[PDB]
Every structure is written in structure tokens, then in C-alpha cells.
Amino acid sequence: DYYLFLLRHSSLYDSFYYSNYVNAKLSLWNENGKKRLHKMFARMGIPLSTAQETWLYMDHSIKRELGIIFDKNLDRYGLQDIIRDGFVRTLGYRGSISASEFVEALTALLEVGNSAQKLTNLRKRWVSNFWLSWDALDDRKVELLNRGIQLAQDLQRAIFNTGVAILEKKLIKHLRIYRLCVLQDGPDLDLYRNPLTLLRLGNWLIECCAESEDKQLLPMVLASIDENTDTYLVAGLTPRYPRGLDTIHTKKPILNNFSMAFQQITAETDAKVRIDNFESSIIEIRREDLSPFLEKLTLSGL
Amino acid sequence: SVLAAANPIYGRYDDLKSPGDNIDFQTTILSRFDMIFIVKDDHNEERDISIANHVINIHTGNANAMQNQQEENGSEISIEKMKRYITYCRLKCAPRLSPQAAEKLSSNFVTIRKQLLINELESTERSSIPITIRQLEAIIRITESLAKLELSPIAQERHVDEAIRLFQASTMDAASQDPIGGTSLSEIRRFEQELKRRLPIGWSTSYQTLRREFVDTHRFSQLALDKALYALEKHETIQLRHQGQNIYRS
């Protein structure tokens, strides 16, 4: 199997287009990335009209020889780390599902489905979504999994559309210690009230940042807006090494000091925050209280 | 069913111009139609602010989210479901009237016919928008269509009242709008001097006494009411309060 987004449920073109690793390695947010992708497709030899069809109706011969095609073509572009070994489950005549696709469907179904009072309503919506995802586990239900797959596609589209705008605007401010970016305004910002969606966006952003020529490993801070509550949702993100690295420079995984920093700042200053999430690196802060807090975090020993 | 869009002569309606020469359609063609809506433009800057905000938000950067919530909170339904519902209702239901509704319809038709005669007699020209039996049939069909929404076998007063309201809107907006079209005006000046001379600023007089005195003189009753409501429309220094009895001069 490959580091691809819903390969067996979407077209191969979209599978290459939405893959995070491919995006990071080929810079698909500008036009040169699309030109390189078209060069890739032409040199492999799959027609552009053929590659834009469903995996079921995709040509049988090319589906059989895809492994050899990838092996011979990926070396020049340097994507030879996309090929791996995975698990596939088949039951009768239903079809084939992979572990990665199933977990993405589960994650998206958790994300989307169905002041203090509104926060409680959001939390009960989240627990209801958890129960619906739990119900989706059993083999007797498949309309609760096809819906999850289509919602995963939609959510990945939205994340890509927001990330391309962020990278256009260059909102990532490079401070001396840690990078910072704030989603002050934009479209569909109501989706990002979910911490797991925010983590997905941050994972894509940190992969894009890591797949660069910069030689600085700095933590990233990401924040959003919820205009109904007038509160910022701030999540701290750890840096990540490139996936194609040896084990000698893996003596210890990168730690996260954001929870310690937040707790120390809140215990030494009367800020109006609410640290109750099980993830100790995710907090809710006030719109007027964000900045002073930020300078404090700049001046405190991380 | 025919849904037609048209523009009056000289672009804008030009309300100062007579209603007779703002529309070029003949009497015959207008009779077949039964809901004539004259949408006029207006300026008060609050509706303008609202419309500007609405269009600015409806720009695709934001609306693509908000309308979605309208399908998540159940405030609106999608187009295809509406199509299925309308074809289902067209196939299944066909309502019918009740004697009380028939009496109310007959009374309303007589009332509007008499009001049309009054407006024609004051204006002294044929109305550019006629009222005939086709309009009575139209109101009946509007009541039946309203009852058809809820699949009710029988149409009752609850639908008839709303249909009558819709017809009143579509009538008072187009047909009976400014029938006067703007003894002549020699009396008009003569009256307006008397009110200033005899009724100072801040005081008030009863309607009955003024009507009595001016019917006693050459003014008579018909002349008084028209310019009474005109000076009220001017609203520069004439105000009504306390029903139709207190003629306050502002």
C-alpha cells in the first residue's frame, strides 16, 4: 500500500493530489507543483482521462502493473518512500478496505456527523458523534462507513483549501523561538472548533514546514476564532523530522513543553483561560487576553 | 400557468405621472392576470444598509457556509424535496369550499366592487386595472391553492383570510394606488388660509366641528376630507392622534 488518500475509493489523480507527503515533496499549492504532477503522469504513461476515473472501472492491466510502473518511475521525483506494506480486509463480495482508509473514515465520522451552555452543547454533540462512530464499527452497517468516507473527502478538500490560502498569505510569523500563525478571518472557520480537525490542519502544516530547506526545529502555535464565544482556541504543535530519516537521529522523540508553559503562565498570572481538555497542550483563551499572554510565553523559559 | 415580468414606460414608475399612461397593456390582457405586483424602489438607507450587507455576505466567500446551517437546523428544505412534495400534493389533494367561506367571498367582492366604483366616480376616467368576475374566480383559486398546501380536503376561514390579505396587497399596490393622480385648487388655497388663521400651532379642534362649519359654508364634506388627509400626508404641521377626533397642529 501507499501513503495515498483513499486510493481504493477515489481516482488516482485525486489520490496523488490530496496526499500530504506528495504535497510536501512537490509543492502543489502553486502552479509548478501541478506542472510536475502532469510531467509525472505523462512519464508514467497513464492518460490524464484514464487517471481521473473510479478505481473500480480503472483499467485492469494498469491496475495490475501499477506496482512496476511506480517502482520504475518514482525514483526520479524522489517519492520512493511512499511504498509500504499494509493490511487489507475482504469479506465475501463486498469489496476491499485498508486499515489506513478505515481509520481515516472513522476519524472523519468523529469530526462531522448528525457561552457555557453552547460549550456544553458542543461537548454533547461530540459525545454523540463518538457513539455514532462506535456504532459504525460492526460489520452489519456500511451506510455508516460510505458516509464517513465521503465526509473524509470533503474535510480533506476543506483543509487543503484553507492551507493553500495560509501559505499564500504567509501568515506564519517567524519569531526567535517558536513560529506563530493566527487564522483571524477567512471562510468556513466554524469547522475548526474541533480540536481533532485543528490537529489535522496542524499536521499538514508541520509536514509542509518540515519538507523545506530550513534547518530550524521550532514548535508551532496555531489559533482559531469562534465568533459566537469570542474565544481563541490555541493548540501547541511539536516539530517532526522528515519521514525518510534513519534511526540514529531518533535517540528520543521530540517532547512537548506547551502544557508546562501554559500551566506555569496561568498559575503565575490571572489570565482568563479554560484548561480542561484531556490534551494538555490545547487551551481556550480570550480574544483580548491572547496577546499579553503571548508575550509572556515569549519571555518565559520554555 | 404564466409568470410574466415587465417594465413600465419611462423606466421607473414615475409616480408623479398619472397611472393611466405608465402601463401600455390593454384592459383585456390585464384581466386574465390576477396577481399584479408593482415593485418600486425606495431610499431610507436602513433597508439600503441591510441589502448591501446581504449582498456583501452572499458573495461566495461566506454564504457557502451559512446556507448549509439552514439545512442542518431544519429551517429550509432542498429544491428536489420541494419538487417531490409539490408533485405529490398536485396528484393527491383537491380541496373544496364551505358556505361560510362563500359568504365571506361574496361580501368581499361586493365591497371591492363598490370601492372601485367610488374611485372611478372621483377620478372621472376608466380604471387602468379592472375588477371583474375573473377576480372573484381568482380569489377562489387562491383559497383552494392555500388549502392544498396542507392536504386539507376542505378549505376554511384560516386560508380565506390569508388569500384575502394577498389580494388586498396586490390590489391596493397597483389598482387603488393614488387614484386621484395628484372646484379645482382655488378652494385648496382658500381652506389652507382658514386653518392657519383660525387654528394656531399647538392647539387642536374636533373633526366634527370643522366638518360642521365647512359643510355650513360652501366647502361641503367631500372637499374637506381629501385635503385633510393631504395636509396630514404633508405632515409639516398637521398630526392625527386619539383616533379620528384630535386634529393636532404640529
Helix/strand/coil (H/E/C) assignment for every residue in chain A: CECCCCCCCCCHHHHHHHCHHHHHHHCCCCHHHHHHHHHHHHHHCCCCCCCCCCCCCCCHHHHHHHHHHHHHHHHHHCCCCCECCCCEEECCCCCEEEHHHHHHHHHHHHHCCCCHHHHHHHHHHHHHHHHHHHHCCCCCCCHHHHHHHHHHHHHHHHHHHHHHHHHHHCCCEECCCCEEEECCCCCCHHHHHCHHHHHHHHHHHHHHHHCCCCCCCCCEEEEEEECCCCEEEEEEECCCCCCCCCCCCCCCCCCCCHHHHHHHHHHHCCCCCECCCCCCCEEEEECCCHHHHHHHHHHCCC
Find the distance separating the first CA and the last CA of chain B, reported in whole Å: 51
Closest CA to B180 of B231, B224, B124: B124
Q: Which residues of B touch A190 (CB under 8 A)?
A: 65
| Chain B nearest CA to A191, separation (Å) | 10
What residues of chain B have any CB closer than 8 angstroms to a CB in chain A? Answer: 61-62, 64-65
Cell numbers found for residue A285: 483563551
Closest CA to A5 of A216, A155, A225, A183: A155
Write down the residue that cell numbers 476543506 correspond to. Answer: A158
Closest chain A residue to B72, measured at CA: A114
| Chain A nearest CA to B149, separation (Å) | 29
Give B68's DSSP letter: H
**CB within 8 Å: B61 and A190:** no
Q: Which residues of B touch A187 (CB under 8 A)?
A: 61-62, 64-65
Torsion of CA A116, A120, A125, A128, to 10 degrees: 180
Distance CA B135, CA B117 (A): 15
| Chain A nearest CA to B87, separation (Å) | 29
| Chain A nearest CA to B70, separation (Å) | 14
- Cβ neighbours around A112 below 10 Å, total: 17
Distance CA B153, CA B155 (A): 7
**CB within 8 Å: B64 and A190:** no
**CB within 8 Å: B64 and A188:** yes
Distance CA B162, CA A170 (A): 57
What residues of chain A have any CB closer than 8 angstroms to a CB in chain B? Answer: 187-188, 190
Which of A122, A161, A190, A227 to mutate against chain B (most B CBs within 10 Å)?
A190
Closest chain B residue to A190, measured at CA: B65
Which of A188, A227, A228 to mutate against chain B (most B CBs within 10 Å)?
A188
Structure determination technique employed: cryo-EM
Closest chain B residue to A189, measured at CA: B65
| Chain A nearest CA to B154, separation (Å) | 38
**Exposure string for A212-233, b = 16+ CB within 10 A, e = fewer:** eeeeeeebbbbbbbbeebebbb
Q: Which residues of A touch B64 (CB under 8 A)?
A: 187-188
Contacts of B15 (CB under 8 A, 6+ apart): B40, B178
Q: Which residues of B touch A188 (CB under 8 A)?
A: 64-65
Greatest CA separation for chain A:
67
Question: How many Cβ pairs within 8 Å bridge chains A and B?
Answer: 7
Beta bridge pairs of residue B246: B206, B241
SS3 B175: coil
Resolution in A: 3.7
Give B237's DSSP letter: S
CB A201 within 8 A of CB A209: no
Distance CA A222, CA A232 (A): 10
Amino acid at A281: S
**CB within 8 Å: B62 and A187:** yes
Beta bridge pairs of residue A83: A2
| Chain A nearest CA to B62, separation (Å) | 6
Cell numbers found for residue A100: 489506513
Q: Which residues of A touch B61 (CB under 8 A)?
A: 187
